[PDB]
Amino acid sequence: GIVEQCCTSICSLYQLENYCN
Amino acid sequence: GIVEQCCTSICSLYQLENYCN
Amino acid sequence: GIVEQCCTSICSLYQLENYCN
Amino acid sequence: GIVEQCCTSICSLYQLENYCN
Amino acid sequence: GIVEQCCTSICSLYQLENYCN
Amino acid sequence: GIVEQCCTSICSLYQLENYCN
Amino acid sequence: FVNQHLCGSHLVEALYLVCGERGFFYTPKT
Amino acid sequence: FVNQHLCGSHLVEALYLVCGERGFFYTPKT
Amino acid sequence: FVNQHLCGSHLVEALYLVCGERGFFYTPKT
Amino acid sequence: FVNQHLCGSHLVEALYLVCGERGFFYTPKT
Amino acid sequence: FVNQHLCGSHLVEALYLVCGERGFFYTPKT
Amino acid sequence: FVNQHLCGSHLVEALYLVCGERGFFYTPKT
Ligand SMILES: [Cl-]
Ligand SMILES: [Cl-]
Ligand SMILES: [Cl-]
Ligand SMILES: [Cl-]
Ligand SMILES: [Mg+2]
Ligand SMILES: [Zn+2]
Ligand SMILES: [Zn+2]
């Protein structure tokens, strides 16, 4: 998921926002 | 400026985009 | 919580493990 | 040593503790 | 330039100083 | 020391080189 | 906002910045 | 180990180092 | 997103994440 | 002072430290 | 606590966290 | 270069950048 995606390829801050509570 | 706007007060990520090139 | 326990007071690395998944 | 070990392969916080005074 | 040089090969703090205002 | 010289007061990068090995 | 390459503590910092007072869960694979 | 004030980003970085692979949660409002 | 005090280094790190490729300027005296 | 290998937010931190109250521009290529 | 992959300033941060008020020496090879 | 308050982790990061290869010591109790 996200942690792998942001690190292995890239991610947007909008995608990260999916991890807030 | 930026320091006034963010350190002493608070700012959003959106205000921070004001300082992007 | 965590912020109360660590920023305003102090906490150990061991208390921090309380918030591991 | 440690700096190489933690960076080239991995290390534990217990190993790091060997570097405190 | 600098950002590439400091990251791809290396750079000195004296070189960075070229980026201050 | 270092903490007195830098956190509570201020220090230069040059004073910090005093603590290099 | 732009795309970001984000590993280690950098990912978790970016989550702190984006989530703020809402908080977040850091859920790596295995 | 030891006891220090960990605020803002510093708290989530400490949790990252502490928890690593395991993941963690950061919930200020609790 | 959210609103937090960003001081010192933390401000320039936030600008980095926010601006990325685009670059930014950090001018305290303004 | 020594040479440094400096990527991502590390470059921008090093610029904060070196430039200080003078500020700086972060101008990546493309 | 878990194992950690730790390079650059990350190693030295982890030493600050682990050692605290006891301090430490950062002694890279060559 | 310039003069700023460097506290906690920020102090050891500054020493890392400054000293690099050479290594350093961080001794709060002195
Ligand atoms: Cl890194
Ligand atoms: Cl802080
Ligand atoms: Cl700070
Ligand atoms: Cl701080
Ligand atoms: Mg950092
Ligand atoms: Zn890093
Ligand atoms: Zn800080």
Residue I10 φ then ψ, to 5°? -60, -35
**Cα(L21)–Cα(K29) distance, rounded to whole angstroms?**
8
3-state secondary structure of G19: helix
Name residue B10's amino acid. I
Q: What is the DSSP letter of K21?
A: G
Compute how many other C-beta atoms are within 10 angstroms of the C-beta atom of residue C20: 17
Which two tokens mark I27?
């001018």
Cβ contact E20:J22 at 8 Å:
yes
Nearest to D16 among K7, K14, K23 (CB): K14
**Cα(C17)–Cα(B16) distance, rounded to whole angstroms?**
33
Q: Which residue has the tokens 């610029």?
A: J15
**Cα(H29)–Cα(G24) distance, rounded to whole angstroms?**
11
Nearest to H2 among K4, K14, K21 (CB): K21
Q: Is G4 on the interface with B (CB under 8 A)?
A: no
Cβ contact E14:E6 at 8 Å:
no
The experimental technique behind this entry is: X-ray
Tell me the CB-side half-sphere exposure of residue G3, using CA atoms within 13 A: 8
Name residue D15's amino acid. Q
Cβ contact G5:H12 at 8 Å:
no
Cβ contact I3:G20 at 8 Å:
yes
Residue H26 φ then ψ, to 5°? -125, 110
**H6 CA to centre of ligand 2 in angstroms:** 8
Q: Which residue has the tokens 């350190």?
A: B7
Residue H8 φ then ψ, to 5°? 50, -140
**H4 CA to centre of ligand 2 in angstroms:** 12
**Cα(D15)–Cα(L5) distance, rounded to whole angstroms?**
31
**Cα(L1)–Cα(F11) distance, rounded to whole angstroms?**
11
Name residue I20's amino acid. G
Q: Is G9 on the interface with A (CB under 8 A)?
A: no
Nearest to L29 among K8, K12, K21 (CB): K21
Cβ contact I7:B6 at 8 Å:
yes
Distance from CA of G27 to the nearest CA of J (A): 23
**H18 CA to centre of ligand 4 in angstroms:** 19
Alpha carbon distances (Å) from B9 to B2, B4, C6: 10, 6, 23
Which two tokens mark K16?
């600050």
Cβ contact I23:J28 at 8 Å:
yes
Cα-based angle K28, K29, L1 (whole degrees, multiple of 5): 45
Residues in chain B whose C lies over 2.5 Å from the next residue's N (breaks after): none
3-state secondary structure of J26: strand
Residues of F in contact with J17 (CB under 8 A): 13
**Cα(D21)–Cα(A2) distance, rounded to whole angstroms?**
38
Residues in J 4-23 with any Cβ partner in L closer than 8 A: 4, 13-14, 17-22
Neighbours of H, requiring at least 3 CB pairs below 8 Å, are C, D, G, I, K, L
**Cα(C1)–Cα(E11) distance, rounded to whole angstroms?**
43
Alpha carbon distances (Å) from D13 to D8, D20, H3, H20: 15, 11, 15, 11
On the 0-12 / 13-18 / 19+ scale of CB atoms within 10 A, L16 is buried
Which two tokens mark C17?
């493990």
Question: Burial letters for H2-12: b for 16+ Cβ neighbours within 10 Å, e otherwise?
Answer: eebebebbbbb
Residues in chain I whose C lies over 2.5 Å from the next residue's N (breaks after): none
Residue B15 φ then ψ, to 5°? -60, -40
**Cα(K12)–Cα(J29) distance, rounded to whole angstroms?**
30
Cβ contact J26:J15 at 8 Å:
yes
**L1 CA to centre of ligand 4 in angstroms:** 21
